[PDB]
């Protein structure tokens, strides 16, 4: 946990922290002499008061002031160094999640929305900054100011004060650490529900168009008001208990340090305690409020932030990629396919796939028809690397798919959906998304073969913008955007699913053969009921509610079974 | 601006602020007596020192301590009252944007993503809280502590100190207010680029699936690193200048208050100034650092937060809805249609619509065919209430569409798209989105007519969840979800666009006639090239690249023009 925080510090990052560590711990020394200086200032007024006993008052006045100026200017140096550190430990932090999300599975990206992660990352940098505000300052600065006090009073031989001052620190730690336990899980849940409070704003602001079109303003507001009060009442539970802990600790200061002020004020009127000794003991308590309270700031803030930070390490940083079965993917390409007894359970309630023992061999065109999405559209999604809640193993040239990590898996297995994923930027962006190694020459080359170079009988520029959810291009052009990424990249096993729903023959002839042209040694798989696409194939499969039922050519399936016979009569 | 901040305070909200105002302004009084108490403590040590001149030292010691305890415990009461206020001024703030977004146009929702608003609202509650931290505390608390100082020193007749103490406050305001001007627009831009820094994370985390599938990890990281440094360097420009302003103001304290400490320390060694008078003047400067610095906190924090808060009022709170042309919508329904010379300019570069003078009359079925999306799909979107960058007026029973506000406009004009807008919750949620007045009885009633009640020959429960971007249901079922909202609501002018792209005759016969059944007096408009849907119509229109070209029946258009003749030959 600690290493991940210190990892954010680069060259300048590690240089400003040690600067922060010294400067703050230096101010503690100069401020510890401060009560002792005024004691000898006060004592001096009852002295002989000759030539040098009026110049000493002047001297020590500056000596006390300098100590204040030094510790004063030290905090401004502390909040300038940290403000410089705030920038440096944000740059190398923003990507330390971006890249963590990339390598993590879709099963943890489908259940997380845009606004969720906007706050999930917001609380991480919020807690680490607070953890630095405690690791640097509150670790040494109070400790140095507190130890001086214990011995100084023990040295001047005021044993009671030397006891009670130690007893407050003795009690204060036990009281806080025991209570922090729940306060931590309460700030945890408070931030966890605060997380969920904006997990709904994400779904709100995105689909507000429909809400405006259906006018359920109240539902939008009321559903949001429900989570809002779920947060407030969970924040009440924490604030209440946190505030109640204060009145306890602050009462103790009046209990212990109040009685010490009483103790010495009694002994001073007699003659057991001098004016200065009394003045020093009261001024010590006066300057004992600063370390005592900042010791508390350490104990709590560190623990509650560490628990709310722990809910960021045990989910994204492994055990998804341990750098294990990175092998292999053949370099001459061609990897075939072999599935043996595939079974899925989404919500456990039913069996998606029952028994699937199939073997496919690369370099030829295959097809998947029958009862629509009964387990044919999903079968290839588990293969492509969406879910790992399946049974058996999917072998691809001596290697099962459950073994290969998602970084090497997507290099050979490229899958085309109906639901295309387009960004909110230039044409170049989405095209260079398939490859950063492909520059302007091959980019415009893939465009003429992706049937989107010349749109409305006029060539499209590469700086042409695109609006969110594919709001810039039509139903047919949204699918052809998903097609440009295919020719720009180079896979070994290609899968196609009902992406020929928003396309016609004048453009379906120039696309279905170009895949065979560019990728001939590859394993092309298509999932579209069209008879003209089911005929070009070397092998056709029928998938009824999960289990495999038929296989072979189109001319044998339209004679043997009656679905392919009742699909070939609708031409 | 100020009224919108005070509006957040309800009954308990307005009660805790006045509690905050008194308690903080009360601590300023007790702390102003503090330097004067120690002055008479110090002076007393050079006195006659009889019976009552050792009991007075004891008395004033408590009197000084109580003053510290009072001001000390006052800050904990201040940060407990504000922590209570933080909850109360968040509940009535979260919706004070949710509802502001609802009434605002799509043209300001298409250009704003989920993560943008997650931070656009985050900085609003961040600046108001800071503004309360200045309006309550820093308005009175320093002012009371500062005025006492001016007269006390003027009363004790130390005219120089009474001058220089006033001169620092005289200079400090002019220095800060002149420099704040740019610092405000720099924190503005800093927060504006910080806004834009996460405007890309929204597009990143949402479409990470494609990035993982196309492996452009570097591009994702590098594009994010580009905005990250665009932020850091814009944050550098602010921090640098802000930090440079400190070393100036803090030098002035050593320039002015340093020389006053020198002034009196010179006059004390002589006999012009007594021990106590000197001790009080030094202790005043000592306790003058607290109001002076907190006066600065007011001057700046208020101005920079007010400018970064101003960029939240002049965009959402009007001039979209002034409560003007709320009239009318006929109660017996039937409102007809009348467009006169419609023209659009998206990027100005071209003319989307050239000349459109058309009149439609309610109670009958209409159609729009021809060259796909050439201005036929967009024509109805400007009508439905998407854009106001058009020419002319669209009259609907003596009222032009440019006049009716979007709240009354969506009640009669309901439009069905291909791109459906589904949420991330239960079946009930999306269904009750069309109406909150419709309970369980009519909800299940619309389901059997929306062809989604009995899915896979098994009835679907109303607590059935749905995954983001329609990831739970298929291409055909995503369109039929958009259809249930139609029968659940009651419009006067219905528009349909290529939503019959992912549907077949066994379900297209049970839907196309049910709209005529449920809404007969309504103006049904369809935009689908299908000949069977173009025949049922009372009037068909042809739309070529913006301008109107043909109108009339299907049997006259398939004889007169050659497109409808070359569309009716493909059956």
Residue numbers in the entry:
A (entry chain A), B (entry chain A): 9 to 579
Article passage:
The ABC transporter McjD exports the antibacterial peptide MccJ25 in Escherichia coli. Four genes are required for the biosynthesis and export of MccJ25 (Duquesne et al, 2007b): mcjA encodes the linear precursor of MccJ25; mcjB and mcjC encode enzymes involved in the post‐translational modification of McjA to the lasso structure; and mcjD encodes an ABC exporter that is required for both MccJ25 secretion and self‐immunity of the producing strain towards MccJ25 (Choudhury et al, 2014). We have previously functionally characterized and determined the high‐resolution structure of McjD from Escherichia coli (Choudhury et al, 2014). Its core architecture is composed of a dimeric transmembrane domain (TMD) of 12 transmembrane (TM) helices, which forms the translocation pathway across the membrane bilayer and contains the ligand binding site, and a dimeric nucleotide binding domain (NBD) where ATP binds and is hydrolysed. In this study, we have determined its structure in a novel conformation, apo inward‐occluded and a new nucleotide‐bound state, high‐energy outward‐occluded intermediate state, with a defined ligand binding cavity.
The McjD‐apo structure was also determined by molecular replacement using the McjD‐AMPPNP structure but only after splitting the McjD monomer into two domains, TMD and NBD. Inspection of the NBDs did not reveal any electron density for nucleotides that may have been co‐purified with McjD. A striking difference between McjD‐apo and other apo ABC exporters, such as MsbA (Ward et al, 2007) and PglK (Perez et al, 2015), is that its TMD is in an occluded conformation, similar to the McjD‐AMPPNP structure, whereas the NBDs have disengaged in the absence of nucleotides. This conformation is called here apo inward‐occluded. Inward‐facing ABC exporters display domain intertwining of TMs 1–3 and 6 from one subunit and TMs 4–5 from the opposite subunit, which results in opening of the TMD to the cytoplasmic side of the inner membrane (Ward et al, 2007; Perez et al, 2015). In the inward‐occluded McjD, TMs 3–5 from one subunit have moved towards the equivalent TMs of the opposite subunit, resulting in the loss of intertwining and occlusion of the cytoplasmic opening. The McjD‐apo structure can be superimposed with the McjD‐AMPPNP structure with an rmsd of 2.1 Å over 569 Cα atoms; their TMDs can be superimposed with an rmsd of 0.7 Å over 290 Cα atoms. The NBDs of the McjD‐apo have separated by 7.9 Å (measured between S509 and S509’) relative to the McjD‐AMPPNP structure, a distance much shorter compared to MsbA‐apo with a distance of 35 Å (Ward et al, 2007). The NBDs have moved in a “scissors‐like” motion similar to the transition between inward and outward‐open MsbA. We designed the A122C mutant at the beginning of TM3 on the cytoplasmic side of McjD, with a Cα‐Cα′ distance of 7.3 Å.
